[model samples]
Target: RQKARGAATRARQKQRASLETMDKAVQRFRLQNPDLDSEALLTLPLLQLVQKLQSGELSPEAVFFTYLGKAWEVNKGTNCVTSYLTDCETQLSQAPRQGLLYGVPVSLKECFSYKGHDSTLGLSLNEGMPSESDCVVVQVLKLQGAVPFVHTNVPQSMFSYDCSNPLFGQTMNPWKSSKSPGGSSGGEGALIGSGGSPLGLGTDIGGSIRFPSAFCGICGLKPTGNRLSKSGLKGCVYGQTAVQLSLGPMARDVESLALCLKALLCEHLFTLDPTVPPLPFREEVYRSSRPLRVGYYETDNYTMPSPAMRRALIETKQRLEAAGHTLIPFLPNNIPYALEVLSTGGLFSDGGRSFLQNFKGDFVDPCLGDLILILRLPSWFKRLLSLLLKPLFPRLAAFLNNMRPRSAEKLWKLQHEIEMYRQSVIAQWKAMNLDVLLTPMLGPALDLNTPGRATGAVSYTMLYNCLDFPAGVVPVTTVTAEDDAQMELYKGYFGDIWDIILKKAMKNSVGLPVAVQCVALPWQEELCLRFMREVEQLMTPQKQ
Candidate 1:
């Protein structure tokens, strides 16, 4: 107990010192830097940066220093970067000059390994432990000459929607300061959103990459799990076997995300980690083909789409359909059963006892707060709770509420059911002969105050994760003030605080960009990227 307290005290002290230094730096630099915040850091496109670098108009060191200086300036205000390495300045000045992203500055999720850098994974158990080498994606990025400038933050254990850890603390949304950026990759979101690092990586089991991207109004690509490599990274709860863990890129634009994926695609992930697929990323499938046949569901079968999300999907559908692509209305294959199966399957895959074992030295990811509450209890306790409710309501924990805690065997059985559901969904798509499916990333949009409740806010993105599909986020249109004044019929969609949290996290109650996902089959990121290009073209010069 004394040891844990000592560790916490030390961490706080260090955090305090770093913060004080950052404040001084920002204040000191601000006097001479009037145009500091106006620099095209977040507003600048990755492709434009590339053009400048390629044309020799901007030196890699010059670009790197510019972003580095600006990033440090905003570091305190955003709480985006968990660790800003002083060595990055020296490293960038001398980094080898070559590759697609040569001299480009990128941040990494503190969850990933970066040779000799501490990957806290946002927990107390692993602290001050430097890794032997960069994780798989990091290695690829370095090979492409991308300089990892700083390590960003994440939710504890990368499970919760909130992006706070005992090691780095919480990262607030750059859009609204006090609000959540959405997690577990929220720090990455904050960093990207606030003009710190424009391109970076984040992992997702259930929308860790996309949720934050959506909340912060950035682009993220959650590829099928294990498409890259997970060899050099480590985290708590090693027993999560049901949901395929995935790492992906979050950027201001889709092209950067494409570069990250294309660079790592099928490039010997097996050599680094045998668990990764041996299949190669097919470049031929994405060669600027015709506008594709797009399948869209305004809302998943589980919940009704919110006004903004529904309008975004409808607008995207109209835009695509007008552009000569076939737009098909898709009825979800009743994802509730399958999603429930996968959700439980993952929580209890190790007989639900392993998570209890992984807890050590007394600290957990904040996201685990809810998981601990649900997973630690006996099934009969839930049954008893349900029984009490059953007297008042005919069904106990039916529909969305019933999606938690079944018997251990029932949870394990869900793995097979989930796979079957995936195959069936794919079969249905094959039958429909659709190329890609477009859907709203979240129900509508969220305010920056707090992230939405875990269960309800999840149904949209969790299904794609459950199926291990390639899902990419694209900002299409903005919500309007007129749209938010809901009538009695749809005014109160959440029926509780569950939906209200999402509302509070929005960049604006209205005028926030409605982010949507373009999903393709597993290993088909190329198609998703092409779709993003189409979406971008469809909506341009139009901003909130």
Candidate 2:
């Protein structure tokens, strides 16, 4: 055991030493300019950048350097960057100007396996584990002339909502430094939120993409599983089939998310990874001018959102209704059961033995400390505690008791139930004639130190992941003092812990961006983005 620990320590030291060289390069550029005027370059969306590059109006080298400068600036403040890709210059020189993402800089999550770089996922033991080839998405991006310049940080094990690990530290929200930017795509959020990079790729199994996007006040989409090719993404949970991970785009706006989608979802992706279905992007579906029937909910029944989040949802509903769209209430059927199936049955399919085993000699981030303890608890003890607490917290009790590690037979039954639940939710959407569903992304940005507590607050986004539906999140408004002052009461389970943490999270959250999530049925990425665009357009404060 000590030998392995010593090896992990040496691995982390070697990787850090290599990263220091990359940092020195950024420092050299910083020394030359002292300050970078990256605004003009970054403000132009991905499509405009592609056009400029193709027309000879912009040089790929110039664009790459501009992004590099700003990325350094963001890294200095938020520590979002892991390593600057060593071969970026080579990729830039050879990049085809006419490609869809030509000259565009795409931020990548730490889990992406870029050649010569470690997808360490913030674990020391994972350091020095370099990939021999680029991930499928990265390969597609490079072939299409996109620059995979930087890898971003993620939470330890890519399991927590908080984006801190022993290796890269924590990523702070660029908008509100005191709050977390969200994770496991947290570094992508902070980089894009600060205008360092315009487009990025993030993986989501349970709100890893959307949480960061919403928390950082940007846009991200969690496409249905297998929507994008996942040939070489690395993580401890790789090949875990209970809940499939999805790779998707994260950007500053819906258009970039849509545009990047066009580049990523291609026949080439299927050619690269035969496991990925050949469902090309449907331009016509995205451009359709049809009105949408929307179903929205304020709460997901397990936890009530903070006041700012509730207002975001209510205002979005009003805006869509005023814009001639039909609005209907979203009633959750078996949501608690679904949460149980996902949180316990799905995530614990291996009895959490592997998840815990990975940390045998490594440091466990405090954000995951409690969860590790809970996940490691004896089954009988958990059941006893759940039974004792059932009188006062029925919902919480049921949730606790559901965490016991189960047999393969039990997991099989749970998988069937998960499919049934997804079908039931889709049925509700069909019965209501809803084009998309709306809900608050989360209860405002989590207090920087409290993401450990915020893990339970992801039903709004995780539901889509559990159902394998296409979902997107867009920032609609900022929290106000009045929204923070709200003291709404709750009569449900775990209200005490929920209320305290929520109120604290809302405190000083004024001016922090609040976002709403949009959902569509499986394989509806184009339709999902279209509704997201509609929502973004309606929410924008138009010029008079």
- In terms of TM-score, how similar is model 1 to the real structure? 0.87
The residue-by-residue lDDT of candidate 2 on 1-544, one tens digit each, is 5644565566457546645765676567557755555577777877787788888887776678778877877777887887778898789888866678888888899888999888877676777678898988999998788999888988889987778887667889888888888888999999999989989999998899998998888989999988888788897864467678888999988888888989887766778999887888999999886888888888887777777788888989998989888899987598777776564568777657778777777777876647788778888888899899888766657667877777878878888888788888888889998888888788477877686765567677777777889988998998887877663443334665544565566577778888999988899999999899888888864300
Q: Which stretches of candidate 1 lie over 4 Å from their true place?
A: 13-43, 266-271, 278-284, 350-352, 356-369, 387-412, 443-452, 487-508, 541-544
Residue range with the least summed lDDT across 10 consecutive positions in model 1: 393-402
lDDT of 1 by residue, 37-94 (tens): 4366446688778767767766675566567666776677877777654455556665
What is the lDDT for 217 in model 1? 82
**Separate clash counts for every candidate:** 9, 0
lDDT for 73 (candidate 2): 72
Clashing pairs in 1: 179-448, 446-505, 446-506, 447-503, 447-504, 447-505, 447-506, 448-505, 448-506
True-structure RMSD for candidate 2: 2.6
Assess each prediction's global lDDT (C-alpha) against the native: 0.69, 0.80
> Which prediction has the highest lDDT against the true structure?
2
